[PDB]
């Protein structure tokens, strides 16, 4: 009575108007696709992470090819064992965070109108040189997986309860204000590594993606490739310039969005404002289940 | 005996390994799609431009929806009547060309390895201010349609004969060396207008598209959207930086590519080198048919 107990402690059906193939909306032969991936994995010795939400995201990332879903699934299970992800919430301590946070922000803050936790990344402010004095790329990546594990174990279940429906994804906002060719080159390895970790071991976890303060050449390229990108990806990716407030306020309440991005949400500066904060439904006693409160 | 005489004066079958749906390769039910669009248009009063190559390009631009092909076809026929395209080769004289060519290059020069005429556009060198003294956007657009009409009436048929196979498309090379946000804004209207004229009244005329000397932010965006653009479009579009020679020499011979782009082709400077030139198979007496030599 632990995983089963956890799964039924929060809503498990995505909203009715959600993309097909998502939990509670799968019907078009995909039910049979789901009820096949579970059989193969049960025989292969696997016991955990076989819930509807999990396998469905694996089936969704691989167009519902039950064969490729097993591959992607085993390969991810291989990775969690090697990397020690299963014990990352209690093994790893990013005690350098207060020291380096200002050079590469990274922080979660409340939710958007769909219940998704909002993740902010001020990539344009990054200062790797000043960061390499304290930490290392390896540790920053451990922090990335540590936060991903907080999202699934604590944040998502709490958000589901607060929104009345599932919520398997997050809403991310990346700020490019301040990027240069120089710093862009200095972060490529971390970005390429972080990209590998999520769309392979955390697929379908992205629900919406916003890039604000994107430079002209960059923003222009998107405006020309729009008609050639699949409609499924243009529904999630948003590339906007210096005028982004109206768009953001259209997805995130206003009382939920930080004042710096055109909203009303203010974090007390006498306890690490925004950068060192982690406030949202997951810190509200009435939305915390049998898994207890997430770490800090 | 004029259009019929013209059509059989040059090869009419695309190479065997070409994209399906192209003349001489259409089979998969598309033959019936072709032999339907012609019937509807014959009843609608249309007499010209009903050859396999034409209608097939219209069917290809609209995924083979015979219904939308008729719409796109009539709408283009409407446009040629209004604009006076049918008589553009003899009505319009871009006598300002020698004066303004240096501010917005534009020139055709020989062919690539597939027989396609190569079109060069040094957009990054554009100087609209210096150009507005002499011409106007309206005239530049008339020149664009005048050149398009030389491509189909003279250039393509000559290239077909020289390559031994059809050739319905052109190979374009756009140079961004020298662009600014400023000049990018100063040319948006011409580019937006020119884009409207080709993919609506000259569809499937683009076979390959190369953008060289693309700025970093711009080039980067393409490298991230690559996996999301359809494989049909990534086969035609190439976005490269300052190192483009190897790629170009891989598509265009070397004796065909101008020295400035990393090749061996040199045009005599005592008669308008490149900018004011128009040399290729269409100026070779042995590749000119009953349509005679193209104008200058
Ligand atoms: C200039 C900005 C470049 C940003 C490139 C993406 C860097 C990380 O962005 C992440 O990429 C993941 C891919 O694994 C997605 O699944 C996540 O939703 C996204 O937040
Ligand atoms: C900045 C470039 C775009 C953001 C990174 C790639 C976007 C999505 O990457 C992947 O796309 C899949 C779609 O098949 C989704 O299932 C996953 O959520 C996501 O990991
Ligand atoms: C920064 C460079 C922006 C270039 C945008 C494209 C401008 C013209 O490019 C033309 O566009 C046509 C679309 O109608 C295509 O059919 C042609 O093949 C292409 O040459
Ligand atoms: C710089 C942005 C890309 C170049 C402009 C758009 C590229 C192609 O535009 C159109 O694509 C069609 C494909 O359905 C082809 O049939 C046509 O040749 C082309 O007009």
XYZ file of C-alpha atoms and ligand atoms in Angstrom:
672
model
C 0.000 0.000 0.000
C 2.395 2.751 -1.157
C 2.289 3.491 -4.899
C -1.345 2.461 -5.135
C -2.102 4.601 -2.086
C -0.298 7.551 -3.735
C -2.038 7.270 -7.130
C -5.531 7.427 -5.670
C -4.711 10.403 -3.424
C -5.103 12.859 -6.344
C -7.273 13.156 -9.538
C -6.161 10.889 -12.390
C -8.127 12.121 -15.432
C -6.894 14.996 -17.633
C -9.498 17.637 -18.614
C -11.982 16.583 -21.397
C -10.683 19.078 -23.966
C -7.068 17.863 -23.588
C -4.989 16.281 -26.360
C -6.089 12.687 -27.195
C -4.033 9.858 -25.693
C -3.830 11.568 -22.297
C -5.233 9.689 -19.231
C -9.026 9.555 -19.241
C -9.208 10.557 -22.918
C -7.517 7.552 -24.504
C -10.007 5.514 -26.497
C -9.043 5.374 -30.175
C -7.383 1.918 -30.115
C -4.760 3.411 -27.756
C -6.429 1.740 -24.775
C -5.321 -1.566 -26.276
C -1.897 -0.036 -26.926
C -1.677 0.891 -23.219
C -2.983 -2.533 -22.174
C -0.073 -4.280 -23.904
C 2.884 -2.129 -22.875
C 1.992 -3.052 -19.271
C 1.914 -6.788 -20.035
C 5.339 -6.812 -21.720
C 6.908 -4.812 -18.863
C 5.306 -7.021 -16.188
C 6.864 -10.105 -17.777
C 10.195 -8.291 -18.173
C 10.420 -8.034 -14.382
C 9.273 -4.410 -13.957
C 6.984 -3.586 -11.033
C 6.878 0.208 -10.556
C 5.894 3.129 -12.794
C 3.289 1.126 -14.710
C 0.356 3.475 -14.051
C -1.831 4.860 -16.849
C -0.178 8.299 -16.745
C 3.372 6.921 -17.050
C 3.075 4.412 -19.894
C 0.717 6.743 -21.754
C 3.369 9.458 -21.831
C 5.852 6.894 -23.147
C 3.341 5.776 -25.759
C 2.669 9.428 -26.660
C 6.347 10.300 -27.154
C 6.679 7.360 -29.557
C 3.444 7.814 -31.570
C 1.851 4.823 -29.771
C 4.300 2.258 -31.109
C 4.130 -0.215 -28.220
C 7.461 -1.633 -29.377
C 9.399 1.658 -29.095
C 7.621 2.430 -25.809
C 9.188 -0.666 -24.196
C 12.616 0.380 -25.475
C 12.228 3.947 -24.208
C 10.824 2.584 -20.940
C 13.594 0.052 -20.206
C 16.309 2.548 -21.223
C 14.901 5.068 -18.730
C 14.775 2.393 -16.018
C 18.407 1.584 -16.859
C 19.330 5.258 -16.395
C 17.572 5.698 -13.001
C 19.581 2.757 -11.624
C 22.978 4.022 -12.838
C 22.452 7.708 -11.936
C 20.917 6.949 -8.528
C 17.793 8.992 -9.297
C 15.576 6.863 -7.025
C 17.489 8.213 -4.041
C 18.298 11.690 -5.394
C 15.760 13.471 -3.148
C 17.689 12.276 -0.071
C 21.243 11.735 -1.459
C 21.848 15.147 -3.065
C 22.178 18.513 -1.334
C 22.573 21.603 -3.528
C 23.910 23.586 -0.578
C 25.682 25.941 -3.054
C 22.315 27.164 -4.339
C 22.162 30.448 -2.361
C 25.651 31.271 -3.635
C 25.145 30.529 -7.347
C 21.394 31.137 -7.849
C 21.993 34.713 -9.020
C 24.197 33.517 -11.919
C 21.678 31.042 -13.298
C 18.267 31.648 -11.616
C 16.050 28.546 -11.996
C 12.920 28.529 -9.836
C 9.335 27.253 -9.674
C 6.550 29.659 -8.717
C 2.823 28.936 -8.438
C 0.682 27.797 -11.382
C -0.807 28.816 -14.734
C -4.562 28.800 -15.565
C -4.463 25.034 -16.255
C -2.939 24.070 -12.896
C 0.581 23.475 -14.231
C 3.455 24.543 -11.969
C 5.294 27.409 -13.645
C 9.060 27.011 -14.088
C 11.235 30.090 -14.739
C 14.747 29.998 -16.244
C 16.632 33.268 -16.713
C 19.126 31.788 -19.196
C 20.020 35.188 -20.589
C 21.491 36.184 -17.214
C 23.669 33.085 -16.919
C 27.266 33.541 -15.817
C 29.072 30.220 -16.037
C 32.509 31.680 -15.242
C 31.301 33.050 -11.909
C 29.511 29.712 -11.345
C 32.469 27.419 -12.069
C 34.182 28.865 -8.989
C 31.593 27.224 -6.740
C 29.897 24.276 -8.459
C 30.338 22.158 -11.597
C 28.239 21.092 -14.602
C 27.810 17.665 -13.016
C 26.242 19.128 -9.846
C 23.979 21.536 -11.759
C 22.693 18.487 -13.639
C 22.113 16.652 -10.358
C 20.063 19.681 -9.245
C 18.080 19.499 -12.504
C 17.150 15.842 -11.887
C 16.518 16.612 -8.181
C 13.960 19.297 -9.179
C 12.406 17.031 -11.831
C 11.940 14.444 -9.066
C 10.238 17.080 -6.868
C 7.900 17.891 -9.759
C 6.612 14.318 -10.121
C 6.735 13.145 -6.481
C 5.417 16.318 -4.815
C 4.528 19.245 -7.120
C 2.355 17.461 -9.697
C 0.254 15.508 -7.189
C -0.366 18.698 -5.177
C -1.254 20.659 -8.355
C -3.666 17.903 -9.443
C -5.550 18.172 -6.147
C -5.690 21.977 -6.380
C -6.823 21.997 -10.031
C -9.341 19.183 -9.653
C -7.827 17.264 -12.577
C -4.574 15.434 -13.434
C -1.758 17.768 -14.582
C 1.299 15.786 -15.789
C 3.129 18.759 -17.269
C 4.796 22.026 -16.259
C 4.655 25.499 -17.784
C 8.120 26.897 -18.455
C 9.244 30.497 -19.043
C 12.755 31.130 -20.332
C 14.151 34.658 -20.345
C 16.839 35.508 -22.916
C 17.261 39.103 -21.764
C 21.002 39.514 -21.780
C 22.213 36.675 -24.023
C 25.322 36.984 -26.147
C 26.991 34.677 -28.661
C 29.692 34.311 -26.003
C 27.479 33.123 -23.130
C 25.338 31.122 -25.561
C 28.480 29.118 -26.363
C 29.412 28.882 -22.697
C 26.075 27.122 -21.839
C 25.601 24.814 -24.883
C 26.896 21.727 -23.062
C 24.581 22.134 -20.069
C 21.604 22.890 -22.326
C 22.409 19.946 -24.615
C 22.829 17.644 -21.598
C 19.681 18.905 -19.854
C 17.744 18.476 -23.104
C 18.923 14.863 -23.293
C 17.771 14.127 -19.719
C 14.204 15.443 -20.122
C 12.900 14.344 -23.535
C 14.290 10.865 -22.888
C 13.729 10.282 -19.160
C 10.935 12.863 -18.566
C 8.933 12.881 -21.862
C 5.581 14.602 -22.226
C 6.422 16.637 -19.127
C 6.388 19.877 -21.144
C 2.918 21.310 -21.586
C 3.727 24.871 -22.587
C 7.039 26.599 -23.452
C 7.586 30.384 -23.557
C 10.759 32.164 -24.626
C 10.597 35.867 -23.788
C 12.967 38.682 -24.746
C 14.190 36.625 -27.704
C 16.601 38.564 -29.960
C 15.389 39.738 -33.413
C 17.156 37.236 -35.698
C 16.019 34.407 -33.448
C 12.422 35.602 -33.178
C 12.271 36.170 -36.936
C 13.341 32.629 -37.826
C 10.412 31.237 -35.848
C 7.962 33.535 -37.646
C 9.080 32.030 -40.971
C 9.122 28.337 -39.935
C 5.709 28.527 -38.227
C 3.756 27.131 -41.227
C 6.137 24.162 -41.490
C 6.212 22.978 -37.862
C 3.512 20.463 -36.872
C 0.377 21.993 -35.291
C 1.049 19.854 -32.207
C 4.308 21.721 -31.496
C 3.113 25.256 -32.308
C 0.431 24.735 -29.643
C 3.169 24.390 -26.998
C 6.015 26.672 -28.169
C 5.770 30.477 -27.964
C 8.607 32.796 -29.116
C 7.968 36.420 -28.198
C 10.039 39.599 -28.084
C 10.206 42.368 -25.482
C 6.416 42.676 -25.417
C 5.360 39.487 -23.643
C 3.164 40.582 -20.697
C -0.199 40.328 -22.523
C 0.649 36.785 -23.673
C 1.861 35.629 -20.287
C -1.120 37.181 -18.434
C -3.248 35.228 -20.903
C -1.852 31.918 -19.578
C -0.917 32.638 -15.983
C -3.477 34.432 -13.747
C -1.806 37.666 -12.586
C -1.810 37.053 -8.850
C 0.368 34.046 -9.791
C 2.906 35.802 -12.117
C 5.949 37.627 -10.599
C 5.827 41.434 -10.746
C 8.995 41.448 -12.884
C 7.147 39.620 -15.688
C 4.113 41.922 -15.583
C 2.126 40.418 -12.719
C 1.204 40.932 -9.054
C 2.982 38.039 -7.269
C 5.590 39.302 -4.804
C 7.957 37.204 -2.740
C 9.383 38.549 0.502
C 12.933 39.836 -0.125
C 13.892 39.089 3.479
C 13.884 35.331 2.734
C 15.199 34.940 -0.808
C 12.793 36.548 -3.245
C 11.908 34.284 -6.178
C 15.385 32.887 -6.892
C 15.584 31.071 -3.542
C 11.822 30.474 -3.167
C 9.523 27.525 -3.953
C 5.943 28.595 -3.296
C 2.803 27.129 -4.773
C 0.073 24.522 -4.023
C 2.810 22.097 -2.916
C 3.441 24.183 0.217
C -0.282 24.421 1.099
C -1.196 21.908 3.870
C -4.571 21.264 2.227
C -3.027 20.009 -1.044
C -0.311 17.753 0.413
C -1.024 14.004 0.415
C 0.547 10.872 2.043
C 3.901 11.787 0.434
C 4.322 14.663 2.867
C 5.921 18.014 2.104
C 8.602 18.285 -0.557
C 12.198 19.152 0.448
C 13.805 22.610 -0.003
C 0.849 24.472 -83.271
C 2.417 26.724 -80.603
C 2.085 25.432 -77.028
C 2.050 21.831 -78.190
C 5.076 22.555 -80.374
C 6.850 24.121 -77.361
C 6.115 21.279 -74.910
C 7.609 18.596 -77.132
C 10.756 20.629 -77.866
C 12.313 19.644 -74.502
C 12.283 16.570 -72.146
C 9.100 16.222 -70.084
C 9.919 13.542 -67.479
C 11.624 14.375 -64.158
C 14.488 12.063 -63.078
C 13.412 8.622 -61.653
C 14.646 9.325 -58.118
C 12.656 12.593 -57.876
C 9.865 13.275 -55.375
C 6.616 11.381 -56.198
C 3.872 13.340 -57.963
C 6.338 15.001 -60.341
C 5.839 14.477 -64.132
C 6.735 10.955 -65.226
C 6.684 9.659 -61.638
C 3.018 10.169 -60.805
C 1.255 6.840 -60.433
C -0.157 6.413 -56.926
C -3.775 7.399 -57.732
C -2.450 10.891 -58.586
C -2.710 10.126 -62.302
C -6.474 10.078 -61.814
C -6.168 13.257 -59.741
C -4.341 14.914 -62.669
C -6.854 13.517 -65.170
C -9.731 15.306 -63.426
C -8.259 18.745 -62.767
C -7.867 19.038 -66.561
C -11.502 18.086 -67.213
C -12.918 20.648 -64.763
C -10.702 23.425 -66.176
C -11.561 22.527 -69.790
C -15.267 22.900 -69.019
C -14.603 26.128 -67.101
C -13.372 27.710 -70.337
C -9.604 27.395 -69.763
C -7.413 26.447 -72.724
C -3.754 27.138 -71.847
C -1.418 25.922 -69.094
C -3.096 22.520 -68.810
C 0.045 20.432 -69.390
C 1.133 17.660 -67.010
C 3.886 19.782 -65.435
C 1.573 22.722 -64.659
C -1.452 21.039 -63.080
C 0.815 18.593 -61.255
C 2.582 21.455 -59.495
C -0.818 22.862 -58.528
C -1.899 19.447 -57.285
C 1.398 19.108 -55.383
C 1.072 22.468 -53.612
C -2.396 21.449 -52.404
C -1.665 17.833 -51.346
C -3.492 16.508 -54.448
C -6.890 17.875 -53.472
C -8.319 18.329 -56.970
C -10.847 20.761 -55.507
C -8.257 23.186 -54.063
C -6.152 22.827 -57.224
C -8.979 24.332 -59.318
C -9.296 27.214 -56.853
C -5.551 27.884 -56.840
C -5.519 27.515 -60.631
C -8.395 29.912 -61.406
C -7.110 32.466 -58.864
C -3.713 32.457 -60.599
C -5.390 32.856 -63.998
C -7.350 35.776 -62.520
C -4.082 37.391 -61.386
C -2.258 37.035 -64.755
C -5.127 38.890 -66.460
C -5.216 41.802 -63.985
C -1.425 42.237 -63.643
C -0.762 41.895 -67.383
C 1.750 39.080 -66.847
C 1.019 37.486 -70.244
C 2.577 40.519 -71.904
C 5.188 41.358 -69.248
C 8.139 40.099 -71.336
C 7.374 42.763 -73.970
C 5.530 45.463 -71.930
C 8.065 46.015 -69.127
C 11.561 47.478 -69.399
C 13.691 47.577 -66.243
C 15.981 50.171 -67.811
C 16.984 51.319 -64.277
C 18.663 47.964 -63.636
C 22.281 49.055 -64.292
C 21.744 51.959 -61.893
C 20.163 50.067 -58.976
C 21.596 46.533 -59.358
C 24.405 47.258 -56.888
C 21.901 48.076 -54.104
C 19.915 44.863 -54.442
C 21.862 42.410 -56.682
C 19.494 39.725 -58.049
C 20.925 37.595 -60.858
C 20.760 34.139 -62.449
C 23.996 32.302 -63.234
C 24.413 28.846 -64.775
C 23.121 25.651 -63.139
C 23.529 23.267 -60.199
C 24.295 19.511 -60.507
C 20.605 18.743 -61.186
C 20.240 21.171 -64.104
C 18.370 23.849 -62.139
C 19.209 27.469 -62.986
C 20.889 29.044 -59.969
C 19.383 32.295 -58.664
C 21.453 34.575 -56.395
C 20.002 37.268 -54.105
C 22.378 39.377 -52.011
C 19.649 40.561 -49.617
C 22.155 41.452 -46.929
C 23.616 44.157 -49.186
C 20.253 45.761 -49.933
C 20.010 49.539 -49.757
C 16.401 50.583 -50.224
C 17.040 54.270 -49.465
C 19.557 54.552 -52.299
C 17.120 52.553 -54.474
C 14.006 54.651 -53.810
C 15.734 57.548 -55.578
C 15.546 55.683 -58.885
C 12.808 53.034 -58.857
C 9.863 51.990 -56.674
C 8.610 48.826 -54.946
C 6.008 48.427 -57.687
C 8.661 48.334 -60.443
C 10.960 45.970 -58.517
C 7.973 43.625 -58.265
C 7.351 43.943 -62.004
C 11.006 42.940 -62.506
C 10.466 39.937 -60.209
C 7.517 38.698 -62.304
C 9.429 39.544 -65.522
C 12.317 37.275 -64.399
C 9.908 34.539 -63.257
C 8.419 34.658 -66.768
C 11.920 34.292 -68.280
C 12.494 31.254 -66.061
C 9.446 29.355 -67.352
C 9.345 30.555 -70.983
C 13.090 30.445 -71.725
C 15.386 29.294 -68.883
C 13.611 26.093 -67.811
C 13.074 24.719 -71.324
C 16.742 25.376 -72.175
C 17.905 23.762 -68.892
C 15.713 20.705 -69.559
C 17.386 20.170 -72.936
C 20.867 20.583 -71.429
C 20.174 18.258 -68.474
C 18.365 15.609 -70.501
C 15.374 15.663 -68.140
C 12.571 18.061 -67.112
C 13.643 20.636 -64.482
C 10.656 22.705 -63.248
C 12.490 24.359 -60.371
C 15.334 26.786 -59.662
C 18.148 26.688 -57.118
C 18.316 29.876 -55.063
C 21.167 31.294 -52.959
C 20.445 34.181 -50.607
C 23.317 36.041 -48.967
C 22.660 37.754 -45.623
C 26.181 39.137 -45.271
C 25.545 42.647 -44.071
C 21.978 42.510 -42.726
C 20.833 44.681 -39.854
C 17.556 44.958 -37.952
C 17.230 48.322 -39.705
C 17.531 47.097 -43.307
C 15.588 43.942 -42.433
C 12.670 46.228 -41.545
C 13.221 48.337 -44.645
C 12.738 45.274 -46.960
C 9.890 43.391 -45.182
C 7.202 44.719 -47.534
C 9.036 43.703 -50.710
C 9.907 40.289 -49.256
C 6.338 39.745 -48.021
C 4.944 40.816 -51.410
C 7.440 38.733 -53.402
C 6.663 35.735 -51.187
C 2.961 36.164 -51.959
C 3.589 36.238 -55.733
C 5.651 33.023 -55.903
C 4.040 30.442 -53.601
C 0.638 31.382 -55.015
C 1.290 32.079 -58.709
C 4.588 30.134 -59.111
C 4.228 27.133 -56.715
C 6.617 24.197 -56.719
C 9.129 26.395 -58.539
C 11.563 26.184 -55.607
C 13.697 23.065 -55.675
C 16.483 24.042 -53.304
C 16.941 27.074 -51.001
C 20.254 28.161 -49.426
C 20.741 31.002 -46.960
C 24.432 31.753 -46.454
C 26.121 34.062 -43.949
C 23.072 33.813 -41.687
C 23.580 35.560 -38.318
C 24.028 33.422 -35.156
C 20.609 33.838 -33.501
C 18.935 33.118 -36.822
C 21.081 30.093 -37.645
C 20.600 28.725 -34.129
C 16.799 28.820 -34.279
C 16.857 26.586 -37.351
C 19.135 24.073 -35.619
C 16.520 23.689 -32.864
C 13.393 23.487 -35.076
C 14.965 20.972 -37.487
C 13.370 17.889 -35.839
C 9.917 19.506 -35.984
C 9.815 20.656 -39.622
C 8.501 18.103 -42.143
C 11.197 16.019 -43.891
C 9.902 17.372 -47.212
C 10.943 20.932 -46.285
C 14.297 20.124 -44.650
C 15.282 18.502 -47.961
C 14.962 21.899 -49.685
C 15.972 24.485 -47.044
C 19.603 24.953 -45.959
C 20.655 27.544 -43.323
C 24.423 27.870 -43.049
C 26.827 30.339 -41.457
C 30.059 31.860 -42.764
C 31.383 28.441 -43.769
C 29.222 27.569 -46.770
C 31.644 26.759 -49.629
C 31.808 22.975 -49.022
C 27.994 22.773 -49.003
C 27.544 24.891 -52.099
C 30.294 23.048 -54.040
C 28.380 19.899 -53.111
C 25.321 21.110 -55.070
C 26.733 23.353 -57.771
C 29.700 22.072 -59.851
C 32.554 24.550 -59.288
C 33.030 25.758 -62.844
C 29.408 26.943 -62.453
C 29.695 28.753 -59.050
C 30.980 32.390 -58.919
C 34.481 32.849 -57.484
C 33.044 35.020 -54.686
C 31.077 32.033 -53.337
C 34.046 29.649 -53.466
C 33.994 28.579 -57.108
C 35.736 29.100 -60.459
C 33.087 30.892 -62.577
C 34.233 34.370 -63.611
C 32.235 36.933 -65.534
C 33.993 39.608 -67.563
C 34.048 42.871 -65.561
C 34.104 44.898 -68.779
C 30.434 44.014 -69.435
C 28.733 43.917 -66.040
C 30.185 41.107 -63.966
C 27.521 38.890 -62.387
C 25.096 41.616 -61.272
C 24.301 42.679 -64.849
C 24.870 39.245 -66.441
C 22.553 36.367 -67.414
C 24.688 33.473 -68.623
C 23.772 29.819 -68.691
C 22.314 27.139 -71.038
C 19.649 29.654 -72.118
C 22.273 31.678 -74.010
C 23.743 28.595 -75.751
C 22.444 28.315 -79.365
C 22.303 24.521 -79.063
C 19.819 24.590 -76.149
C 17.413 27.237 -77.488
C 14.149 25.967 -79.006
C 11.291 27.474 -81.124
C 10.783 30.150 -78.431
C 13.998 31.864 -79.478
C 16.443 33.618 -77.173
C 15.229 35.198 -73.953
C 15.338 39.009 -73.546
C 17.966 40.897 -71.481
C 18.208 29.878 -26.463
C 17.331 28.953 -25.636
C 17.576 27.500 -25.980
C 16.702 26.589 -25.140
C 16.780 25.143 -25.605
C 16.018 24.219 -24.672
C 16.712 24.108 -23.318
C 15.867 23.411 -22.262
O 14.446 23.491 -22.317
C 13.827 22.236 -22.015
O 14.087 21.350 -23.098
C 13.498 20.059 -22.872
C 14.016 19.147 -23.939
O 14.626 18.015 -23.345
C 11.984 20.164 -22.856
O 11.390 18.875 -22.690
C 11.608 21.068 -21.689
O 10.203 21.268 -21.674
C 12.319 22.420 -21.837
O 12.065 23.226 -20.697
C 13.112 25.338 -27.952
C 12.837 24.129 -28.836
C 11.514 23.461 -28.503
C 11.501 22.898 -27.086
C 12.283 21.556 -27.019
C 11.536 20.476 -27.809
C 10.065 20.501 -27.473
C 9.420 19.182 -27.019
O 10.218 18.052 -26.678
C 9.414 16.870 -26.519
O 8.308 16.944 -27.448
C 7.430 15.804 -27.315
C 6.506 15.851 -28.538
O 6.649 14.696 -29.365
C 6.718 15.839 -25.967
O 6.118 14.566 -25.718
C 7.671 16.097 -24.800
O 6.942 16.749 -23.765
C 8.937 16.883 -25.094
O 9.964 16.323 -24.297
C 16.114 36.849 -44.048
C 15.727 36.179 -45.357
C 14.226 36.047 -45.492
C 13.856 35.387 -46.806
C 12.372 35.059 -46.877
C 11.986 34.533 -48.247
C 12.073 35.631 -49.303
C 11.953 35.108 -50.728
O 12.394 33.792 -51.046
C 11.489 33.123 -51.929
O 10.300 32.836 -51.200
C 9.332 32.162 -52.020
C 8.054 32.115 -51.242
O 7.012 32.700 -52.001
C 9.842 30.789 -52.419
O 8.860 30.089 -53.186
C 11.101 31.001 -53.249
O 11.669 29.743 -53.583
C 12.115 31.825 -52.443
O 13.244 32.123 -53.250
C 12.888 30.885 -45.731
C 11.602 30.123 -45.442
C 11.435 28.911 -46.343
C 11.314 29.304 -47.811
C 9.886 29.829 -48.125
C 8.872 28.686 -48.006
C 9.384 27.452 -48.707
C 8.469 26.801 -49.756
O 7.308 27.472 -50.236
C 6.479 26.593 -51.017
O 6.586 25.259 -50.468
C 5.810 24.311 -51.232
C 5.762 23.036 -50.380
O 4.428 22.689 -50.006
C 6.409 24.134 -52.623
O 5.467 23.459 -53.460
C 6.715 25.464 -53.310
O 7.801 25.263 -54.209
C 7.016 26.656 -52.419
O 6.444 27.792 -53.042
